[PDB]
Amino acid sequence: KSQTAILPEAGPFALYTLLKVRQNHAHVLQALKALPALVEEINQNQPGAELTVSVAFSKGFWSHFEMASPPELIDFPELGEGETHAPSTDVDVLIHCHATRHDLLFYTLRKGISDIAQDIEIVDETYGFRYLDARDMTGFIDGTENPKAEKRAEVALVADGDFAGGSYVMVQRFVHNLPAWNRLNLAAQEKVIGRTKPDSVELENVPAASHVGRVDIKEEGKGLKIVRHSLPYGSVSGDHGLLFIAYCHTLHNFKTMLESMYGVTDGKTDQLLRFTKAVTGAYFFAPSQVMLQELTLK
Amino acid sequence: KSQTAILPEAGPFALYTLLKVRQNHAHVLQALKALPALVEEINQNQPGAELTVSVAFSKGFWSHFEMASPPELIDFPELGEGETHAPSTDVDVLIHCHATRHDLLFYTLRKGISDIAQDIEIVDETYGFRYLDARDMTGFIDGTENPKAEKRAEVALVADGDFAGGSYVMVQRFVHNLPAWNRLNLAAQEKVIGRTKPDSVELENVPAASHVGRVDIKEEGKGLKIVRHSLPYGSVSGDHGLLFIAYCHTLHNFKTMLESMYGVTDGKTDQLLRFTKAVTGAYFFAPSQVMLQELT
Numbered sequence: 001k002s003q004t005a006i007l008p009e010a011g012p013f014a015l016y017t018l019l020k021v022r023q024n025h026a027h028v029l030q031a032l033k034a035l036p037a038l039v040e041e042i043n044q045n046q047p048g049a050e051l052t053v054s055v056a057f058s059k060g061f062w063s064h065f066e067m068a069s070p071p072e073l074i075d076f077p078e079l080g081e082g083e084t085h086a087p088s089t090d091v092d093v094l095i096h097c098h099a100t101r102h103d104l105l106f107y108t109l110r111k112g113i114s115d116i117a118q119d120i121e122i123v124d125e126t127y128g129f130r131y132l133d134a135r136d137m138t139g140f141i142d143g144t145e146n147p148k149a150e151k152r153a154e155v156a157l158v159a160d161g162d163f164a165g166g167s168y169v170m171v172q173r174f175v176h177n178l179p180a181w182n183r184l185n186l187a188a189q190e191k192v193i194g195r196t197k198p199d200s201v202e203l204e205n206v207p208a209a210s211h212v213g214r215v216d217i218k219e220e221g222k223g224l225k226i227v228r229h230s231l232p233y234g235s236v237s238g239d240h241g242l243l244f245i246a247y248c249h250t251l252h253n254f255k256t257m258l259e260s261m262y263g264v265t266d267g268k269t270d271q272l273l274r275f276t277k278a279v280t281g282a283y284f285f286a287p288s289q290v291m292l293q294e295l296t297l298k
Numbered sequence: 299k300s301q302t303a304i305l306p307e308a309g310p311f312a313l314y315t316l317l318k319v320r321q322n323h324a325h326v327l328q329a330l331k332a333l334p335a336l337v338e339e340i341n342q343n344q345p346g347a348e349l350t351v352s353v354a355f356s357k358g359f360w361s362h363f364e365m366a367s368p369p370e371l372i373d374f375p376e377l378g379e380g381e382t383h384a385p386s387t388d389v390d391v392l393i394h395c396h397a398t399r400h401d402l403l404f405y406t407l408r409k410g411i412s413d414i415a416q417d418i419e420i421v422d423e424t425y426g427f428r429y430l431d432a433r434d435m436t437g438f439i440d441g442t443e444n445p446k447a448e449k450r451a452e453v454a455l456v457a458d459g460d461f462a463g464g465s466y467v468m469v470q471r472f473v474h475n476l477p478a479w480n481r482l483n484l485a486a487q488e489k490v491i492g493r494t495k496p497d498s499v500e501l502e503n504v505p506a507a508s509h510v511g512r513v514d515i516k517e518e519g520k521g522l523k524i525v526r527h528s529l530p531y532g533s534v535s536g537d538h539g540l541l542f543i544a545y546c547h548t549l550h551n552f553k554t555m556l557e558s559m560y561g562v563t564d565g566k567t568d569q570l571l572r573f574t575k576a577v578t579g580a581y582f583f584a585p586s587q588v589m590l591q592e593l594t
């Protein structure tokens with residue numbers, strides 16, 4: 001059994017919290033374990049909320065656990081240079097929630113960490129929201145080729161072993177340059193993305209440097225697929241863009257797409273990265289519900 | 299006719315923007331005048347959105363109008379002493395929106411303002427949201443005694459004259475100190491607010507220093523009423539609290555309440571201000587739809 005946030009389709013609103021554990025590690029772990037029980041209680045008090053949660057830990061923080069770390073779990077490596085850079089964030093824990101209402105997300109975080117506020121530093125706290133008809137602020141629909149129904153389970157979740165039901169996670173908070181992106185016309189923007197803007201139909205000739213051209217990778221030969229839970233975020237006068245987050249049964253897919261996007265593989269960078277920049281970056285592993293409740297410090 | 303955001307009840311989501319005008323005043327004003335048409339168009343394209351808008355101007359910016367300022371419109375004065383202080387924010391325009399969805403609030407602001415972003419500096423941009431069962435983040439329900447239905451029109455809107463249909467506006471962004479508020483027990487919090495916490499029942503004895511005690515003012519009268527469109531805002535790790543915004547036919551009600559709260563009237567300050575602090579304070583006047591389009 002995976003954690004409730006991973007498999008279902010993303011709700012209209014989402015919470016993505018990155019935090020660092022400074023002290024009282026045992027108290028913090030307990031508080032994190034008690035999140036599912038809190039969420040269940042909220043759902044019982046609030047029909048239609050469909051509140052979900054997934055707690056994940058970084059490679060560095062996993063050392064504190066008695067349970068052995070996932071085979072592929074590593075630190076998020078920095079990629080690229082200058083205007084095409086993928087920063088690495090010092091973070092121990094990811095808290096991911098999504099629901100049909102925004103307020104319960106704030107409540108879940110406030111109530112959930114109330115006792116461990118002084119033990120924790122929240123590195124980043126992003127509230128995502130569905131934008132129009134599932135569109136990114138770039139005007140293009142996001143999630144068109146995102147796995148659906150049954151194949152979500154076999155793409156996101158580890159199939160076998162001790163970590164079965166668990167999932168590898170990546171997150172990158174992107175900040176958009178909307179005016180620069182606005183300069184390009186419809187056809188040009190479609191060349192950057194690789195799909196049509198109004199109906200998200202894949203172009204007959206997908207440019208290799210286009211975003212889809214960068215991330216549509218098959219090497220098996222079978223497509224490297226991930227389950228994305230990303231959602232637009234931010235304000236007009238401040239940071240705004242996309243909180244990218246994805247789950248996968250293997251971290252290899254993340255690494256391949258990122259190395260392809262940031263010019264490690266081909267030497268060519270993603271055209272989309274001309275109009276957006278990653279400000280955070282981290283790898284995690286979200287264990288099954290059982291393992292999460294069985295995790296203990298050493 | 300008033301502006302669409304004032305009279306109806308506040309939606310589950312709201313946008314509150316304070317901004318200052320750098321230059322190109324003529325074609326910052328025109329862009330602001332175009333906002334109602336934009337909101338209506340969004341409402342047509344998005345049924346059920348119930349998107350609304352209200353544009354208001356401060357006393358400082360009303361100098362640019364050939365039209366004279368409302369008789370009661372003043373610069374927001376600094377009030378209080380000690381921890382209890384009411385800061386004054388130099389701002390030209392207020393853009394107030396609320397709807398049944400959040401995404402259209404960002405869409406409305408980005409669309410309506412980005413063209414004049416070169417001429418405009420956003421002083422504050424706050425996204426409010428109704429929290430649980432209409433509760434403030436202190437755990438107390440907000441809006442229990444807020445005017446309803448037929449009362450809203452007579453409380454918020456100017457009845458007569460040239461400025462009829464318009465409304466005086468006040469805005470204050472509050473920052474809550476929740477852990478300090480958390481140290482107090484249930485009874486102490488209720489005495490500070492002036493009502494019971496779970497069901498917002500007014501205390502038989504409302505202390506003069508309590509928040510209700512400060513704002514429940516009698517002038518014979520004896521009921522000074524305002525229409526509050528306030529809504530909780532913010533993040534856990536950052537600023538969070540209440541974006542207070544209120545409409546009224548007279549600015550006198552705002553000034554009287556604020557004088558009472560910050561220990562100017564009697565010398566006693568609002569007990570609630572021990573746990574929250576205003577970081578923004580401003581007065582406006584939202585013109586009627588007619589005056590709005592003819593302001594020059």
Ligand code: HEM
Nearest residue numbers: 136140141142143144145146172174195215216242244257
């Ligand atoms: C940063 C790492 C990212 C990765 C690893 C990633 C991954 C993917 C994948 C696997 C697909 C589907 C490919 C296919 O068609 O088979 C996709 C599509 C797409 N992504 Fe990304 N993405 C990233 C960032 C972004 C950003 C920052 C944006 C927007 C600002 C974005 C917007 C889109 C759009 C518009 C599509 C096409 C429609 C769709 O199938 O969802 N992506 N991405």
Ligand code: HEM
Nearest residue numbers: 434438439440441442443444472513514540542555556574
């Ligand atoms: C952090 C700031 C504030 C908080 C948390 C707060 C909270 C509350 C609460 C819980 C109530 C009782 C429920 C209700 O009747 O709505 C109330 C009442 C009220 N408040 Fe506030 N308030 C704040 C600021 C203000 C300010 C600055 C003003 C005026 C300048 C104001 C004016 C009023 C009025 C007119 C009432 C109705 C009292 C009555 O007639 O029973 N509030 N407030």
